[PDB]
Write a protein that binds this ligand. Structure first.
Ligand code: NA
Length: 240
């Protein structure tokens, strides 16, 4: 997250860190949202590589013991069947991870609530992106979980020629684009939390930013629109 602030450690208890095994260590690669005690929602592109993945719930500082973490292996990966890794612009950038164990819930570990199917946010709706991704274009990962306030940009504006044009689809949410605050590499897969009727819900799964940089004016961060995939998510969980 470029232009973020440090999150309070109990603000976003559905945020997870998706990590891969790297030598004798683990490396953060993506975010995700805990949606059942044994299921995480993330981006499909996060799990393109043939790696050994784990999820960390209750994580705040990637580099220090928080005293709240639970570490769990990924047992099964179900990528959306229409996903195509060389065409992120087509959409379908979503995957479900079944965890090897069910995590225990507490103030640091909670299920993300998802929007009702079909919900579309008004332009300029209030949302926060969260994650450990780069804090500058071509920078380094955050140590502590970051948040940035990223107002939505509706489809009509986001798909206009000076924004994303054809690349953004109605199955996506755009947010931000002010040139200061954005998602960045390592935030993919994590949540966009939007405040609706007094309750935050996870309306987006972070999917992509500009090839020209993270915080680029009129290139809002682009998220998979969770409310377009409710039936898919429910069908996957029911059949696994
Ligand atoms: Na930690």
């Amino acid at each position: 997250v470029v232009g973020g602030t440090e999150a309070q450690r109990n603000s976003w208890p559905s945020q997870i860190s998706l990590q891969y095994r790297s030598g004798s260590s683990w490396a953060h690669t993506c975010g995700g949202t805990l949606i059942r005690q044994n299921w995480v929602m993330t981006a499909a592109h996060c799990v393109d590589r043939e790696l050994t993945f784990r999820v960390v719930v209750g994580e705040h500082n990637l580099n220090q013991n928080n005293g709240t973490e639970q570490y769990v292996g990924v047992q099964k990966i179900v990528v959306h069947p229409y996903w195509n890794t060389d065409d992120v612009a087509a959409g379908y950038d979503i995957a479900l991870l079944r965890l090897a164990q069910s995590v225990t819930l507490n103030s640091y570990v909670q299920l993300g609530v998802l929007p009702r199917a079909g919900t579309i946010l008004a332009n300029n709706s209030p949302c926060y992106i969260t994650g450990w991704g780069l804090t500058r274009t071509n920078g380094q990962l955050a140590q502590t979980l970051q948040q940035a306030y990223l107002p939505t940009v509706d489809y009509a504006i986001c798909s206009s020629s000076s924004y994303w044009g054809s690349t953004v689809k109605n199955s996506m949410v755009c947010a931000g684009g002010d040139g200061v605050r954005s998602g960045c590499q390592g935030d993919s897969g994590g949540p966009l939390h939007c405040l609706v009727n007094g309750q935050y819900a996870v309306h987006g799964v972070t999917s992509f930013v500009s090839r020209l940089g993270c915080n680029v004016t009129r290139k809002p961060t682009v998220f998979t629109r969770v409310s377009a995939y409710i039936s898919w998510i429910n069908n996957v969980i029911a059949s696994n």
